[model samples]
Target chain A: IEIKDGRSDNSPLPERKLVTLIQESYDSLKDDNEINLSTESTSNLLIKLVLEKLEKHSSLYKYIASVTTLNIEGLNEENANFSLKNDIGASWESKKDGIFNYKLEDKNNNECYLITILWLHK
Target chain B: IEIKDSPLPERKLVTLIQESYDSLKDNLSTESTSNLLIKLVLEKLEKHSSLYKYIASVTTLNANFSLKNDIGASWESKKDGIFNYKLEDKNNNECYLITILWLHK
Candidate 1:
């Protein structure tokens, strides 16, 4: 979740680009209070942000490009609701080295939880 | 799962790069009729083969620069195999917007 200058020794920073987008989109949602803006809106926003960022980052693009195979593990019933409006899932063995596989799921009705297997790689 | 030339209209090719790696690694497992060599191998030989392929395809760097928040999706599961992954279990709003959002994660 930390974003740092890939080469720098600065303290780690959370990757908030996706969170920012979700907050922005949720604010614009017509039924902000009635509608659960956390899960669906947040997940979509995060995924979109990541893709957009990847497009801008060469290292990300190469990482994605290097992805030769993508596997979608089956969904757990407990986490199935998120898929009703959006796709929620995880990826195994990303193209990048030293990064653990991750599962993106909806936490509350408004938040999407990103569970990463930290420090498992490299 | 499918990969293709972004601009080209072809049956989306299933990206098999990761699968290949997994398969290769699984092949070298000891539980099999043979030990899994994919997971571990002589670094010098492995790097030699890998680097040679990369060097041959070094011209593909141009694609990396154009990466943008292209709408896409992928699926995954726990490494310990404890959690059953699902897209439907989460919030429906994120699921709906997922197809519409034009950003990268």
Candidate 2:
């Protein structure tokens, strides 16, 4: 399973592999117990890690990774009505470029994160 | 009001401004509400006859919570521009929208 140098069905960073890679990075955190969003913190580290992983695997494409984290603790109130909305639209070379978004919830600590990964042809 | 080739702009490619309406503040499903936000925004752009390609993202967050965002991009600064807005709502929620635009050849 090696990354090819072009955009093809067998190349271009498989969506499934991209998702799995990010999920694994999150799971590899030393402790998902504490929530951090500072410049030198866990969340930022995850963003860097993601970019690094993508760079290592797919060297021919440009990448952008964004992480948005919100502390969702106490947001589970059944009686309270709270709503949040997020969506993305992009106009690009659809055949050679793509975007992916993933939502992760840490129910143990009541934190949630939204991750977006975009790749563009070089 | 100026036209340049670089991504970092003297003026943004497009900017959107709107006040909260009844439809936006009412209780609507999360997916549909967001859909309306993007639809309205894009339609407005279309009416302006914009020719550049755009990457638009809209997100709503609780005013009571602390949110942090980090972005890492491997892009050419000379070819793309990013713009962001922190919009106030009539209610407790805050709206954050960002757009990245690049010219079309």
Candidate 3:
């Protein structure tokens, strides 16, 4: 980091292209707790990014309250297929290391809107 | 009463399963009949422990793996709902516990 009173050779990385999401922005939602953030500042970049770009003001998708990390073993083809089969009705998408990603739904309305549920598979 | 976007397993009678985004994606699979994901995890646990207690009677391990039976995770409909019950370990005769996880942003 470049400290105010410090000097450096730009140590972390000389050149880089990075994408950052704001946690505070995502957290400030109440009614729109499940809105997807997929644009220049959104966090989850699977579906919304590829298709429609929601108006960027504030997202209704739930903020990242907390994320529990996990790594699944036997990420073979069978379990890969088997992994997608669950009651929550999540759709699997590809990511680094062949990991699958999912978002759960509304606990109250039984709709697939809430981002409260998260599942990662390998 | 507990689980996760867990990469694996380990049960007690758990209390709260921390959900994750990746595992949550399993819900998007518009194929594979029923709640294959939830049941798959439950399948790995005890169907019934020592005291001849069944998960179905206590938890909704029966309703196509629906949480409505008390495990009603979809709604959090019953926070203090009496879905969870007591159970005994088979060989040890030890007691077990189960608590629901209600995660939000």
Candidate 4:
């Protein structure tokens, strides 16, 4: 593939790389005891932090990152029936631009979060 | 002037989101919820033709405690942005988080 200049090969970040970056960044928040799984502010902080990392490193693309956090501390059977479905369709260069979603859950901690990042080549 | 932190949606995008969700509310299904949202948004965007292209994401979840979203975008500041809408359907015990990211073509 003839890679484009400055866009880091002009390809979407590899799935493993994207997943690892998000996981590490998210875990860093926990390490500092800075994120409260029960709070919404942490979700905002997490996505902001992640977006910074992505933008700073991959300056060739524009990106959108969203974090969704669901508090399941005492999810009863009634609410347990709840289902979540997400789909993203972009009208852009499909060959070079893409979206990635990562799911993070800690049953022991009663935490569930979803992170989605969309990258568009400039 | 103090600029906002992230991309904010215009009124047009906001209305489009609500209308799209409303149109899909009656027919929402677990299997096709996301697809329905995408389709609805695209249908509405047909009016704009090729002036802009968008990425629409819908997340429907049922939770008693909390469901929150935070979005960050690195785009052209003014020409590119995102719109978000949340709908609570108590009858179905569901909450839908709809987000649209658009860029000028």
Fnat across every predicted model, in order: 0.03, 0.66, 0.03, 0.80
Report lDDT (Cα) of residue A102, candidate 3: 31
Residue B53's lDDT within candidate 3 is 14
The candidate with the higher DockQ, 2 or 3, is: 2
lDDT of 1 by residue, B55-79 (tens): 0010000000111111222322121
What pairs collide in candidate 2? none
Q: Kindly list the per-residue Cα lDDT of model 4 for residues B58-79, writing each as its tens digit.
A: 7778524676666777643566
Proportion of true contacts reproduced by candidate 4 = 0.80
TM-score of 2: 0.63
lDDT of each: 0.24, 0.57, 0.23, 0.65
Q: Which stretches of candidate 1 lie over 4 Å from their true place?
A: A1-49, A57-61, A65-76, A79-100, A106-122, B1-105
Residue B91 lDDT (model 2)? 59
The per-residue C-alpha lDDT of model 2 at residue A79 equals 33
Clashes of 2: 0
Point to the candidate with the largest TM-score.
Answer: 4
Q: Pick the candidate with the highest DockQ.
A: 4
Query: In model 4, what are the clashing residue pairs, if there are any?
Result: none
* Angstrom error at residue A95, model 4: 1.4
Docking model 4 quality class: acceptable
lDDT of 4 at A119: 75
Q: Residue B25 error for model 3, in Å?
A: 25
What's the chain B TM-score of candidate 4? Answer: 0.70
lDDT of 4 by residue, A1-122 (tens): 11111223333566667778888887877775564655546566677677777877778887777777777655643335555555677654356776777787755556678877777777
Of models 3 and 4, which has the larger lDDT?
4
